[PDB]
Amino acid sequence: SIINFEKLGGGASGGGGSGGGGSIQKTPQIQVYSRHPPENGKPNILNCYVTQFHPPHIEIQMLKNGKKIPKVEMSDMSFSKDWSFYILAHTEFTPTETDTYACRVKHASMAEPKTVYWDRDMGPHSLRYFVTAVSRPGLGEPRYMEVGYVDDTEFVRFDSDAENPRYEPRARWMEQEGPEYWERETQKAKGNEQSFRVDLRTLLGAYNQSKGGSHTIQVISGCEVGSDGRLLRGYQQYAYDGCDYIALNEDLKTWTAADMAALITKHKWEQAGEAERLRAYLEGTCVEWLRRYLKNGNATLLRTDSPKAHVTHHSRPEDKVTLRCWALGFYPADITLTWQLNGEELIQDMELVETRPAGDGTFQKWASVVVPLGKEQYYTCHVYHQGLPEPLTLRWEP
């Protein structure tokens, strides 16, 4: 259960521009790839994974031979520990030898839309809440969201942009909770929404910003627990427009403010004993709720799907060749791919893509090395994943 938030209630910054709020946009990173191995004439799914951007407003289109594809589904949006947002767009398609596909992204961080073409060739536990409050001048009320994670898997979500916005389960094992739980969480979410609505107005003043601009307040709140069930770390950190604003220190007693506006909040919270209130929630309430949830889904959280791996062979200019090592259909996302030349792990001639969602709950990743034509048998790829009885070692097999 997420804590009931206390207003930031600040009042003045100084427009210094250090790193705590106001606009300082992050450019999106984009990957375009098929869920399944592309085979001409066989239906598949094409993905456009967009990450690392800020602000959260973004426009994504997928194109077929330069023409917009009308039916493109969008996953719900989320954000990372570095505050940047991510989202997955995808569409059904049936690849052919000559049709080109692309994903086009429009975002305030870039002067023009970025088009990226698809190239076939190439223990402990935690209960954390990720909160987003985004003002939208000229587009209605601020959008408010609370997304909860147990061990990094989304299990609950509240999004004010529904019509009768309610807390909804996001993991099937949560359906074990009765109507009282949902009603209570929903009402608490609506109460929290109001505090953030106010805080957004307050921060406009604190940073001397226009009433016509869009702004974001984000929060990461929660507890990390040991195998013995004891608290290892508590978290209560805030960001304004993608930059650290204020955070509770590891001692759960003091705060670290990032700029002048946050100093006003630090002093308010110190005077009101906010840290004390949070320490109580983090050490008790939060942990108690984590156990409760783990009761329903620990088994699910421990499941693993081993990667299926193989090596593909690609031509390069002159005496060269690219060996690409693929890891597919694995879960969870954590994985390590390495290339070795006679015992030594390679660094310099290698290329990796960020681990990405296949769209069906599993993940994908690949690592490549450029090597001399004729020397393919001197290299081996190694795949390390918790789902495997032991690391996989593979080589290019003609």
UniProtKB/Swiss-Prot annotation:
Annotated spans, Alpha-2: 213-304
Domain called Ig-like C1-type: residue spans: 307-395
Protein name: H-2 class I histocompatibility antigen, K-B alpha chain
Residue span of region Alpha-3: 305-396
Keywords tagged on the record: Disulfide bond, Glycoprotein, Immunity, Membrane, MHC I, Phosphoprotein, Signal, Transmembrane, Transmembrane helix
UniProt topological domain (Extracellular) ranges: 123-398
Assembly with partners or alone: Heterodimer of an alpha chain and a beta chain (beta-2-microglobulin).
Subcellular location as annotated: Membrane
